[PDB]
């Protein structure tokens, strides 16, 4: 059988759609990847992909940090 290897090393999920950069940037709070990420819900963290309205999605990992 083949070897379906993916992530070595990242940890990162992802999930989203529309919740790109609009999301991340360190200017806006429109907690959008929040709302996103909720429907996710298991989710402590994840990550902000560039795009920008439905280029790149958002990660969300269990990973991030400690969902305490």
Known sequence: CPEIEAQGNECLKEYGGDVGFGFC???????????RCRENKGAK???????????VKCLCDF?????Q
Not at 63 to 67: K, Q, R, V
């Open 45 to 55: 963290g994840g990550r902000c992909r560039w795009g920008q309205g439905s280029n």
């Open 63 to 67: 990973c991030g940090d400690t969902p």
């Open 25 to 35: 940037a360190p200017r806006i709070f429109p907690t959008i990847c929040y709302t």
